[PDB]
Design a protein around this ligand. Structure first.
Ligand SMILES: [Zn+2]
Ligand SMILES: [Zn+2]
Lengths: 77, 116, 107, 295, 49, 162, 50, 107, 184
RNA sequence: AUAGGUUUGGUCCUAGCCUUUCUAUUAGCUCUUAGUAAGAUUACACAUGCAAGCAUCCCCGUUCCAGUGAGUUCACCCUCUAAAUC
């Protein structure tokens, strides 16, 4: 694609960004949907983030982790 | 490379031939080529219908959970497929474009009845 | 080997390819083969076969015609055998030839 | 409680009935050939090699699990009537995972009714063979599994390989696996080559099928003709345990039948051609008077 | 509610670990706020050109 | 003929035929051995036959060999915590020392099997990538899915001829 | 590695020039109110703001 | 912890001509990919010694430093494992020149 | 037209014998190593080339899934591999037809091939899991409320509707329309 | 390499060169269809068209994609740790 130093073209030296016709009830019910979704997938994202953090923390230091560590050290001695 | 700024993105990568598409769910950095360096392939989506006809899709749901929990920004077709599946709530636009056709068929039903 | 009746064998000749040394060395080796019954008689042990096609099944091919030795064969760990670098190259996959396993006609 | 296929007593009995013919278990197969290796051993190490061959034959001769058919699943998880009418074709999905067992992973279907139905058994097997392929299974069902083709391999006496192909393609709890197995068993009962399925792992399965849906007449017939007599008795014993409310069983503990009698009893009680069973026992005992005179 | 498939895996996982525990898999939502499309940002997290 | 007395020692199956896979604590192995004397024959054969096998499997452990400096042959292990295990080898044999080090500072069969299991976890059967890493490259294969145009021409639902 | 002293010097004087002679808010968001074109920017405004 | 790659390295002292530093020579075994025989390869390491306790010819155990001191000093002395000539048998802690016991073990 | 007959006739034992059909043919080539592919077609148009190949020399030797003796002639006996085209001397056309015929005979049953005893796919053979048993149904599903109530259209207050109009007039589009139910 | 041709008056040995195989580009001569892969020689000079918008004004993006092979051990592992996404 183009860079910051490409002369802009003629065809786009003027071109109206005519915006889309806003319908009414679809716009508001669509907003109420967009906000509900962002909320529930945010909840799912927090669940997955805390699950990943749990996996990292129990793998680093859990109870079976300490168990196999102490078993290995005792076997070494 | 590095790519100044950016995040991971669970997205679809085209990998078929002409007139025969196929998307492989990939967890790649956003600032990377479409078909390029992916951190982990998370699944595959064959959109053409089978001989029996079942449009197969596949998902390492556990690894998708891991990468979402690591910070992957899921893209819109991935949100569509995950709604279709049931790992994510049905996407707003997949119900809104539904109601746009529902009323479009009606626009036809009435006009058709007037013709008859 | 079609005149002898040998149907399946691999052979590579190197050095000088003189026909009147090739035939003579071939006949020398093939007439100085050691057979399975002679090996069994010389060592006093059973000569048994292990094919990968059949499985772990032991197939006795030659038993001694005299007494059976009861001291087992000495398992000489790390045997002192003279190996061929071509064989080891083919085993390790560093034998790169565009001539080796070519699709040829029958026999 | 009735012992199933996997109880210790019945599993040992079925074992002896099978037999371990090493020259049939480990048999020359037409695969790719590598040059044979040779070893030099004494009698003791030859005996050790034969013992290890026997143990490996037991490992190869471990019995496949006979199991009951599976209830055809029809469980609608959800139904999105709003999505109904949007897409034309279905959309099957698989939690490929890596560590979840194949009978524990979630496979679902989304239909043009909006129904999020759980995937059927056949679709489940097809999906797991696509994403996790196992050597031998092709997701399109083999054409060899039909009437005329299966009969062709029956005529060419290929029943062990019929069962081998059935094992690879279909899961044991599936209907096809059961139908193909039972049709093969009815075929071999009709003509009768119990030596053809001997030393194979599918012998114990033919026995249970016959004893459970009782047709063990040809089994006893071949058993005694071929002097498999400790077998014959164990086979009756197994029938008597599997049907303990049979008049044969009642007469068995009444008459203290301990050997051949156990069989004669069966003939005089429930054998459909008990004249032939009893007659082959008299001929077997005529030959026994002969080799007892030889002894 | 959890989405249908995720609900099925959760109830199946605990069904497997043991306890039947047939309560519906609810998740808490009141932790998540509801800032709409009018809420303002910060000018150091911004940058004039 | 391959050069050397025992040509089997340079054959890449003998090297990956060893059994000692040192733990991640060992860093230095030092082998002090005596060239003459009937008692140090096990250490001499251990240097001759088994040191190549140890390094191929433990590739980052420094193995230094020292000749007739002490009147008794012995092995030493410098471990990352700071430890200095000493294993004398006088009146032993190379197989005996092999067993000895696999018991003392060598990983167990469960550990190497488990470490091996983690490796296979990467090559996943469902993945569809190029034949260097995966097993199938497109679903244009799995018979039942639409084939790759190249092999079987696509019906006239394709674009252009629409 | 040969030091990139010229690149570093150019970066530094570019940063100092940017810090010092930074264009101000007045000659930035000012507006030709008839054609909606800001100056030094040259881009007009979106359709929701005319 | 340490940013230095080599944690522990046993080496040999080459020179003590720099103040409070020993030039040491680590010898590791690298496999010839063709010949498949391990040949000793050497890397020079500069160890820090505070007490000037190592002379030339000693075998020394060098541990790493959390962060390099100089451009090349990345290691410090941990033990003069074997001191030139003055070598004490580790097995029997009795002095030994080489192959003979200067002081007897059955003391 | 119907095979399985010539190879049991007398002319097959007169021209050939107990020997292979392909055991008389030598492909002419630049000497030494043969080209590592046979011709693509002995029969171009309806004309036969100079050295017809083993299959293209006796029009009567038809190739299909039931000509079992010819199929076993072209497949090896000690190893279960199909003989390659330089080995046999057949064309790329016939070799392809022969591979098809051998395969069709193999899954039609009129050809013996070794099948390996496979090991079980899984270890646990249970069927007691959520994907292979029932799930306790959803409150919505025992009822008829849609999953996630935000899917159903619900008209907001006309105060919000007119606030929307105040935000977006001029380019405003048409009205709404509660979505239909059973679209045809 | 399953190897072959060639030193001589002839033989044996050593040996170079070439042949037989597979691929790629170009040249000659000549070429029916359909599908698909791939497609400057030149880091030489470029006419002309297009390739960066979005957006209630801020910002954000134009630092990416796409291209080339000039230069060339800035690509890998570990430690440490700054933008960045949660
Ligand atoms: Zn393809
Ligand atoms: Zn032909």
């Amino acid at each position: 694609r183009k860079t910051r130093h490409d002369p802009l073209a003629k065809s786009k030296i003027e071109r109206v960004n005519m915006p889309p016709a806003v319908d009414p009830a679809e716009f508001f019910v669509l907003m109420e949907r967009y906000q509900h979704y962002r909320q529930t997938v945010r909840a799912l994202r927090m669940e997955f983030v805390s699950e990943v953090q749990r996996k990292v923390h129990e793998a680093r230091a859990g109870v079976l982790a300490e168990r196999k560590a102490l078993k290995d050290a005792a076997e070494h001695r | 490379k590095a790519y100044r700024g950016g995040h991971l993105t669970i997205r679809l990568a085209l990998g078929g031939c002409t007139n025969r598409p196929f998307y492989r769910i990939v967890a790649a950095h956003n600032k990377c080529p479409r078909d390029g360096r992916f951190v982990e392939q998370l699944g595959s989506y064959d959109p053409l219908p089978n001989s029996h006809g079942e449009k197969l899709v596949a998902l390492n749901l556990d690894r998708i959970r891991h990468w979402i929990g690591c910070g992957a920004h899921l893209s819109k077709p991935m949100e569509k497929l995950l709604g279709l599946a049931g790992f994510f709530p049905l996407h707003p636009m997949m119900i809104t474009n539904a109601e746009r056709l529902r009323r479009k068929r009606a626009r036809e039903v009435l006009l058709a009845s007037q013709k008859t | 080997c079609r005149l002898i009746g040998i149907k399946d064998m691999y052979a590579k000749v190197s050095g000088s390819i003189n026909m009147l040394s090739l035939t003579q060395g071939l006949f020398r080796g093939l007439s100085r083969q050691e057979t399975h019954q002679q090996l069994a008689d010389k060592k006093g042990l059973h000569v048994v076969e292990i094919r990968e096609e059949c499985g772990p099944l032991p197939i006795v091919v030659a038993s001694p015609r005299g007494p059976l030795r009861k001291d087992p064969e000495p398992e000489d760990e790390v045997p002192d055998v003279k190996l061929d670098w071509e064989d080891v190259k083919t085993a390790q996959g560093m034998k790169r030839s565009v001539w080796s396993n070519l699709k040829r006609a029958a026999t | 409680k009735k012992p199933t296929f996997m109880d210790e007593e019945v599993q040992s009995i079925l074992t002896k009935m099978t037999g371990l013919n090493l020259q049939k278990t480990f048999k020359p197969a037409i695969q790719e050939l590598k040059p044979p290796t040779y070893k030099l051993m004494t009698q003791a190490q030859l005996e050790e090699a034969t013992r290890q061959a026997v143990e490996a034959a037991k490992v190869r001769l471990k019995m496949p699990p006979v199991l009951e058919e599976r209830v055809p699943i029809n469980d609608v998880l959800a139904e999105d009537k709003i999505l109904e009418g949007t897409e034309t074709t279905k959309y099957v999905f698989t939690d490929i995972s890596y560590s979840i067992p194949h009978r524990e992973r979630f496979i679902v279907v989304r239909e043009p009714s909006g129904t999020l139905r759980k995937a059927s058994w056949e679709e489940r097997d097809r999906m797991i063979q696509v994403y996790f392929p196992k050597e031998g299974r092709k997701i399109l069902t083999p054409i060899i599994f039909k009437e005329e083709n299966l009969r062709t391999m029956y005529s060419q006496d290929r029943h062990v390989d019929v069962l081998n192909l059935c094992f690879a393609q279909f899961e044991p709890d599936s209907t096809e696996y059961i139908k193909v197995h039972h049709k093969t068993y009815e075929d071999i009962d009709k003509r009768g080559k119990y030596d053809l399925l001997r030393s194979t792992r599918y012998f114990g399965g033919m026995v249970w099928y016959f004893v459970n849906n009782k047709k063990i007449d040809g089994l006893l017939i071949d058993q005694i003709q071929r002097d498999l007599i400790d077998d014959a008795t164990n086979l009756v014993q197994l029938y008597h345990v599997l049907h303990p409310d049979g008049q044969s069983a009642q007469g068995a503990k009444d008459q203290a039948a301990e050997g051949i009698n156990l069989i004669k009893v069966f003939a005089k009680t429930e054998a459909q051609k008990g004249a032939y069973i009893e007659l082959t026992l008299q001929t077997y005992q005529e030959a026994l008077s002969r080799h007892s005179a030889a002894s | 509610p959890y989405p249908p498939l995720l609900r099925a895996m959760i109830i199946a996982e605990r069904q497997k670990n043991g306890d039947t525990s047939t309560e519906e898999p609810m998740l808490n939502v009141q932790r998540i706020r509801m800032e709409p499309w009018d809420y303002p940002a910060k000018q150091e997290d911004k940058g004039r050109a | 003929p391959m050069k050397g007395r025992f040509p089997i020692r340079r054959t890449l199956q003998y090297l990956s035929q060893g059994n000692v896979v040192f733990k991640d604590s060992v860093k230095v192995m030092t082998v002090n051995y005596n060239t003459h004397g009937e008692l140090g024959e096990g250490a001499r054969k251990f240097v001759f036959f088994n040191i190549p096998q140890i390094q191929y499997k433990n590739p980052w452990v420094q193995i230094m060999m020292f000749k007739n400096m002490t009147p008794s042959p012995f092995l030493r292990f410098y471990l990352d915590s700071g430890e200095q295990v000493l294993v004398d080898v006088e009146t032993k044999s190379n197989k005996e020392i092999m067993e000895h080090i696999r018991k003392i500072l060598g990983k167990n069969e469960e550990t190497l099997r488990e470490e091996e299991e983690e490796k296979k976890q990467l090559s996943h059967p469902a993945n569809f990538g190029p034949r260097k890493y995966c097993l199938r490259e497109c679903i244009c294969e799995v018979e039942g899915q639409v084939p790759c145009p190249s092999l079987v021409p696509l019906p006239k639902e394709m674009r252009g001829k629409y | 590695v040969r030091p990139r002293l010229i690149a570093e010097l150019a970066r530094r004087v570019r940063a100092l020039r940017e810090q010092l002679n930074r264009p101000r808010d007045s000659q930035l968001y000012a507006v030709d109110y008839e054609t909606l074109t800001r100056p030094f920017s040259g881009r007009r405004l979106p359709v929701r703001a005319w | 912890r340490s940013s230095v790659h080599a944690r522990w390295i046993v080496g040999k002292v080459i020179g003590t001509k720099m103040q409070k530093t020993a030039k040491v020579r680590v010898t590791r075994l690298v496999l010839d990919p063709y010949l498949l025989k391990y040949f000793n390869k050497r890397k020079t390491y500069f160890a820090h010694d505070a007490l000037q306790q190592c002379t030339v010819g000693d075998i020394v155990l060098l541990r790493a430093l959390p962060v390099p001191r100089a451009k090349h000093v990345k290691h410090e002395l941990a033990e003069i494992v074997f001191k030139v000539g003055k070598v004490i048998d580790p097995v029997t802690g009795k002095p030994c020149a080489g192959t003979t016991y200067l002081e007897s073990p059955l003391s | 037209d119907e095979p399985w007959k010539y190879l049991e006739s007398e002319e097959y034992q007169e021209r050939y014998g107990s020997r292979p059909v392909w055991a008389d043919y030598r492909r002419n080539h630049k000497g030494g190593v043969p080209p590592q592919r046979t011709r693509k077609t002995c029969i171009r148009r309806n004309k036969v080339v100079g050295n017809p190949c083993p299959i293209c020399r006796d029009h009567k030797l038809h190739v299909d899934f039931r000509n079992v003796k010819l199929l076993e002639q072209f497949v090896c006996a000690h190893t279960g591999i199909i003989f390659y085209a330089p080995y046999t001397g057949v064309c790329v056309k016939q070799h392809k037809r022969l591979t098809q015929a051998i395969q069709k005979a193999r899954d039609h049953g009129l050809l013996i091939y070794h099948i390996p005893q496979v090991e079980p796919r899984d270890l646990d053979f249970s069927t007691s899991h959520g994907a292979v048993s029932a799930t306790p149904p959803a409150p919505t599903l025992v009822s008829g409320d849609p999953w996630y109530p935000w899917y159903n259209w619900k008209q907001p207050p006309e105060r919000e509707l007119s606030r929307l109009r105040r935000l977006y007039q001029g380019h405003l589009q048409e009205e709404s329309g509660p979505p239909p139910e059973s679209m045809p």
